[PDB]
Symmetry: C2
């Protein structure tokens, strides 16, 4: 019925889904891999969007971050990895995505998450934020914590894919 209407997103059944999952991923952990695996099971396509210029200087440069994640996720066919240097809402719009994936780890973050989601609604009304809890196995890990344990020689093999674990050891002398 294209001669009459192109179609709206709401009230008319299911629509193609394309999600972005933004972060610094410095470096990508098993917790990140789980979140995107879950997301990619339920949406048509997923972009892991890696932040080029985080406020805090990252251990891995953008090129490195994008390379490690590309490797770690290459077994997911509906996933692509990209760097971006923009508001997450701008990137979503440029990428014609309609879903924004957020990992929801802690209570401390809930308010902040809701508030970002309100801002993103304001910026891009057609973008829906979707919140996944991390698996219990990855509930206490973060890029930051893994780096700091690794720095002081703790075992973090259980928390990273092999490519990332190797790149991390190289960074730490």
């Amino acid at each position: 019925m294209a001669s009459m209407t192109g179609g709206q997103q709401m009230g008319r059944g299911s629509m193609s889904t394309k999600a972005i999952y933004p972060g610094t991923f410095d470096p990508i952990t098993n917790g990140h891999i789980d979140i995107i695996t879950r997301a990619a099971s339920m949406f048509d396509r997923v972009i892991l969007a890696i932040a080029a210029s985080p406020s805090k200087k990252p251990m891995f440069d953008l090129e490195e971050r994008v390379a490690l994640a590309t490797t770690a996720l290459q077994h997911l066919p509906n996933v692509e990895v990209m760097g971006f240097s923009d508001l997450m809402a701008n990137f979503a719009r440029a990428q014609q995505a309609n879903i924004l994936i957020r990992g929801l780890r802690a209570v401390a973050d809930f308010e902040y998450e809701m508030q970002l989601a309100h801002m993103n609604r304001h910026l891009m009304p057609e973008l829906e934020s979707v919140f996944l809890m991390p698996s219990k196995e990855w509930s206490f890990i973060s890029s930051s914590l893994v780096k700091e344990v690794a720095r002081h020689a703790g075992d973090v093999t259980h928390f990273l894919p092999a490519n990332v674990h190797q790149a991390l050891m190289e960074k730490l002398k």
Copy 2:
């Protein structure tokens, strides 16, 4: 291939906030069931039949949404309905805690079910069934927070 999601709740009664969540969900999943708890441990104002009837009407305009009562383990229902997604609205910080606990248990009981969370639109961010009833019980205006069919039914229940 197909996605089919359950949005469970007590829906006593369904509000504009619940309606917003399920509209958003039905745009992203092929099918959505509104799963209404038959026997909530605290007796509801509306019985199950009333809850289902109000919700059916409220959501009639959404083609890929079905409203159902259930009285079993959510994992058993999801399995019975061949659902692979569970939707929850996430309004309060207090809910997040409890919901994260149930989600973990649900992962133990049914690994193949993914739990997904939506935040309420800003408009609906402070409403709940419980609040709206409390306000309406003392004649406060709650026309803004309910669909007509539900509003009338609530007025009838209070008179």
